[PDB]
Amino acid sequence: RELGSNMVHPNVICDGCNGPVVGTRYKCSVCPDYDLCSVCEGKGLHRGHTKLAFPSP
Ligand SMILES: [Zn+2]
Ligand SMILES: [Zn+2]
């Protein structure tokens, strides 16, 4: 796998773990305001809605 981005996405909070979103941001494409950090996405949270991957802010 290619070494991903590693920047903080400012003013984005992970709805999974309430942490910062560092690296890729996974924004749900169905929910109006739902995001996962790559750690929570990796854990399989919010499975059932397609998310969009934003590597960088
Ligand atoms: Zn998280
Ligand atoms: Zn959703």
Tell me the structure's resolution in angstroms, rounded to a single decimal: 1.9
Q: Which residues pair with 26 in a beta bridge?
A: 36, 53
Number of domains in the chain: 1
Q: Pick from 43, 18, 48: which is nearest to 35 by CA?
A: 18
- Give the number of the ligand closest to the Cα of residue 18: 1
Q: Is 17 annotated as a binding residue?
A: yes
Please tell me the distance between residue 18's alpha carbon and the centre of ligand 2 in angstroms. Answer: 16
The answer to whether 28 is a known ligand-binding residue is yes
Find the 39 Cα to ligand 1 centroid distance in Å: 6
CB-count burial class (<10 Å; 0-12, 13-18, 19+) for 14:
buried
Say which residues have a Cβ less than 8 Å from residue 34's Cβ, sequence separation at least 6: 15, 27, 28, 46, 49
9 is in an annotated binding site: no
| Structure obtained using | X-ray
Range of the domain at 33: 1-57
